[PDB]
Design a protein around this nucleic acid. Structure first.
Lengths: 102, 115, 45, 123, 50
RNA sequence: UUAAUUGGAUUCAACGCCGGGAACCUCACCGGGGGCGACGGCAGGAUGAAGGCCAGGCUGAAGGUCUUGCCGGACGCGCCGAG
């Protein structure tokens, strides 16, 4: 038994759900078992900074957030199934990284 | 007579640099071990062969952090305080202290009536 | 031009050619040495 | 006028004009070294192919050493009446005492011709 | 002799790309930008308000 | 007080403030050392660089200065405007 682990990461949630949905359709169309997409913990990058450019005024601070969501999909070996993933249109924001595990 | 670490200046002259730095405090020995600056070594050559007499120029330096060795004893060096190269006269007790401690870069601060 | 003398049909060079770079590299005549400042190379006479 | 001391032959006007044209063409489509210093450096290196020397150079010692220098190194040297002519032929506003060609470019057909017209002059 | 000395540490080793301010340059994962510059560009980097 | 505590900021609403970093930098402070103002114009020109560089005296050192002498081979200083 051999498996492929795919991690799909995006800031946009809807792009990620569309990519996952088309991967699911591909995996069920090729009839190869797929582990359901496990949504791994989303990374919240936080940066705070003082609003005022100079040093004047009340101590005012602004919070800036980046929520980036990533998901894990594991599939069983099938060269036909792996041929169709490189043709998947991937949006500019979604990054897909694929590794092969025994 | 002058005694440092249990030894005299004229006995301090003949020891090598490694043992001599072993007798030193941790900071000065660490600075000596990690290596003198190239300007520090140029100035060391200058004063060393000035002791022998060949370099007859009045010796002046910026190396406020020069550490005085026992072999340098018996000389005069002008150390920069920030505006002028103030003289300092090397005696046998100089051993174990930096140059910049000794030149006044902050003049005396007296106090008067409040404004 | 002033560093090439000529007698009897042959060229005398007023200064020694520096072997590091090649011909046309005269040397500095100090009496006690032959020096070239292109790299600070000195050959003591 | 008396010919300078370094003169070893009399170059005709037409031959001097051909030498100037060769200087211009070698400047245009070749390589020339301007100045007696660089002429000497090239002749000593052997790269020189033909050395043009002005005949109204006020200090003789600048061009005094060129004729025997080129004879010893077996490279033809030719004369031109005016230093300003050689400077104009060299494409520079200042006056060129001598020009040493390195790449004849399109002046070979002149320079090689000039070669015999130089080799006949020393005979 | 006009080149500035190399510095791998300290404030002088660091300079904002945009305005060149030697001072506040936040480095959360390597932004390399002055703090005041950050305000007018954070949405362009995707940052939102919540 | 200082050779400097660079300057700014004022009752709230300046005062762990400009600085989300004052050992060299941060520099904007003090004292000292050295160094290029481009381009159009005059003049000069290469009959040799304006840069390098010994040996060294003077410069904190740094061809930095100076006697120094050769160099890579090629056009660059002072002014008028003017960056």
């Amino acid at each position: 038994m051999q498996k492929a682990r795919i991690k799909i990461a995006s800031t946009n949630v809807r792009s990620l759900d569309e990519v996952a949905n088309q991967i699911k359709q591909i995996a069920e169309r090729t009839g190869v078992r797929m582990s359901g997409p496990i949504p791994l913990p989303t990374k919240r990058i936080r940066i705070t900074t003082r609003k005022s450019p100079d040093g004047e005024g009340s101590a005012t601070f602004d919070r800036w957030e980046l929520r980036v969501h990533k998901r894990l999909i594991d599939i069983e070996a099938d060269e036909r199934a792996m041929r169709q993933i490189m043709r998947i249109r991937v949006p500019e924001d979604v990054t897909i990284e694929i590794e092969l595990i025994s | 007579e002058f005694r440092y670490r249990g030894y005299t200046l004229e006995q301090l002259m003949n020891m090598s640099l490694e043992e001599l730095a072993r007798l030193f405090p941790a900071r000065q020995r660490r600075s000596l071990k990690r290596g003198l600056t190239p300007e520090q070594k140029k100035l060391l050559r200058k004063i060393r062969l000035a002791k022998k007499g060949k370099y007859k120029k009045p010796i002046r330096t910026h190396c406020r952090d020069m550490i005085i060795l026992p072999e340098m004893v018996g000389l005069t060096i002008y150390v920069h305080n920030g505006k002028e190269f103030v003289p300092v006269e090397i005696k046998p007790e100089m051993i174990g202290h930096y140059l910049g401690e000794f030149a006044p870069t902050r003049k005396k601060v007296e106090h008067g009536a409040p404004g | 031009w002033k560093l090439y003398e000529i007698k009897d049909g042959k060229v005398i060079r007023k200064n020694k050619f520096c072997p590091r770079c090649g011909p046309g590299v005269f040397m500095a005549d100090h009496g006690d040495r032959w020096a070239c400042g292109k790299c600070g190379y000195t050959e003591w006479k | 006028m008396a010919k300078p001391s370094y003169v070893k032959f009399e170059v005709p006007k037409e031959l001097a004009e051909k030498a100037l044209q060769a200087v211009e063409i070698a400047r245009d489509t070749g390589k020339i070294r301007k100045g007696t210093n660089e002429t000497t450096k090239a002749v000593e290196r052997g790269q020189a192919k033909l050395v043009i020397i002005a005949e109204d150079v006020d200090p003789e010692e600048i061009v005094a050493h060129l004729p025997p220098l080129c004879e010893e190194k077996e490279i033809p040297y030719i004369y031109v009446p005016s230093k300003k002519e050689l400077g104009a032929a060299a494409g520079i506003e200042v006056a060129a005492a001598s020009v040493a060609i390195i790449e004849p470019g399109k002046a070979r057909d002149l320079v090689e011709e000039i070669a015999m017209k130089v080799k006949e002059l020393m005979k | 002799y006009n080149k500035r000395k190399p510095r791998k540490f300290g404030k002088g080793a660091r300079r904002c790309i945009r305005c060149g301010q030697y001072g506040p340059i936040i480095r959360i994962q390597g932004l390399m930008l002055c703090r005041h510059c950050f305000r007018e560009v954070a949405p362009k980097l995707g940052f939102r308000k919540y």
